[PDB]
Design a protein around this ligand. Structure first.
Ligand SMILES: COc1ccccc1CNc1ccc(C(N)=O)cn1
Ligand SMILES: COc1ccccc1CNc1ccc(C(N)=O)cn1
Lengths: 237, 237
């Protein structure tokens, strides 16, 4: 159906086995709903030692990705992708990823994800080769590979066939009925589907209010949600 | 020195090869600065088919992790960890991870990371077994493994020997001197270390202001930073 092709530029393509070989994403790859293809800048070097890093102009402690191997790898991935592929660079300086941003990225049938190492890539390559710069969160990692895999996993959930409202999820319970003295809320045993739906929605509203109140500010609550939230806040007091 | 031990509870322990076998984190593991030990709930099942999921009370589309295998795996990891280990559950409902939160978590010499699959774990296990619940970002994934690896990588950077201010990083440049007509800022060639430091700081301030203005609100800028930021905003106008 709406399959997705993701090209990856990475010095450590074997890291991507974590998503291509296991779980829901591994099944998506096996079933051809998701295709992940990697190019390694090390394969585009020409010197004896296959050098992939370079020193920044102006000095400093860190290194950058060497331009020539990385640029050639990107160009090769773009040629394999054809037209319509969006090239994404993962960095702390990028647009912060959220579920809304995931749904936007999932609209692309083709993506190329550039995984920086060291202190990242040359600023001019961002200008000449990168369409969009994204961050998975306000923290620093040793490479863009984990952010790239996180993005792949999140967008894969929107591909039809891969899987089997602004609020945090409600609590969930399974067997057994009592666990270290803690019982399951009786409503979940009642079999009354409408009471269960309202209980879960009310719990999601209460949990969002208590834990992430700023998420509620970005929402236009329905009539039902306004009432259940008021009830939850009244019981809390 | 300040080595770190991280126990992991996961149905897919082989995903963690992505951090234990490659790059800076793989070296940290090889050098015994970081130890990652995994327990798989599937090994704690007793039925013929090694069942690790269970149905939620109250119905619904999703499944939960089965309590008994997961609980036994957690208890085994806690016994291997000894005293002082903090047990962390990765979920979208958790505290949002940022670099400040990474530095807090890195203060622990021992961590146990519980990786949920399906719709997560029973709420009572969070109450009885989990010390802290964290999220790597406001998006949903197919498992907690990628969040757990992201956390491991971020905290590993604070372990002394693993590697070789609230603002986004400045642009960086490497060879060649001209790339598709784009030149390197002459100051970075000048060799004047003080001018380079001020240029980079000014660029970091300008970039944070243009891209993530809310990050500036949480900062008490130094005298030098206030001046360079004013200069950047004046040149922008
Ligand atoms: C200092 O490292 C870099 C510097 C610049 C670019 C890439 C890297 C690689 N590391 C990353 C990558 C992405 C994210 C994120 N928040 O999306 C976090 N870390
Ligand atoms: C619906 O999935 C779950 C539901 C509940 C718990 C765990 C999972 C596993 N998936 C995750 C895990 C963590 C994060 C995060 N933002 O840290 C995102 N997704």
């Amino acid at each position: 159906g709406s399959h997705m092709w993701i090209g990856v530029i990475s010095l450590f393509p074997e890291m991507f086995k974590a998503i291509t070989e296991f779980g829901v994403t591994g099944r998506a790859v096996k079933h051809n709903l998701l295709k992940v293809e990697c190019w390694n800048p090390r394969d585009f070097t020409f010197d004896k030692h296959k050098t992939v890093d370079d020193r920044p102009y102006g000095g400093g402690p860190g290194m950058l990705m060497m331009v020539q191997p990385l640029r050639d790898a990107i160009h090769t991935a773009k040629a394999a992708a054809g037209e319509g592929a969006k090239v994404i660079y993962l960095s702390p300086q990028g647009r912060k990823l959220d579920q809304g941003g995931v749904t936007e990225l999932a609209q692309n049938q083709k993506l190329i994800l550039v995984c920086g190492r060291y202190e990242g890539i040359d600023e001019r390559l961002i200008q000449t080769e990168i369409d969009e710069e994204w961050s998975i969160g306000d923290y620093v990692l040793t490479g863009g590979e984990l952010p790239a895999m996180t993005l792949i996993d999140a967008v894969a959930r929107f591909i039809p066939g891969v899987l089997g409202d602004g609020l945090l999820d409600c609590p969930h319970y399974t067997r057994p009925e009592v666990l270290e003295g803690l019982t399951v809320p009786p409503v979940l045993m009642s079999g009354h589907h409408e009471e269960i739906r309202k209980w879960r929605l009310k719990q999601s509203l209460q949990r969002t209010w208590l834990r992430r109140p700023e998420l509620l500010e970005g929402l236009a609550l329905t009539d039902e949600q306004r009432k259940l939230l008021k009830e939850a806040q009244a019981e809390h007091n």
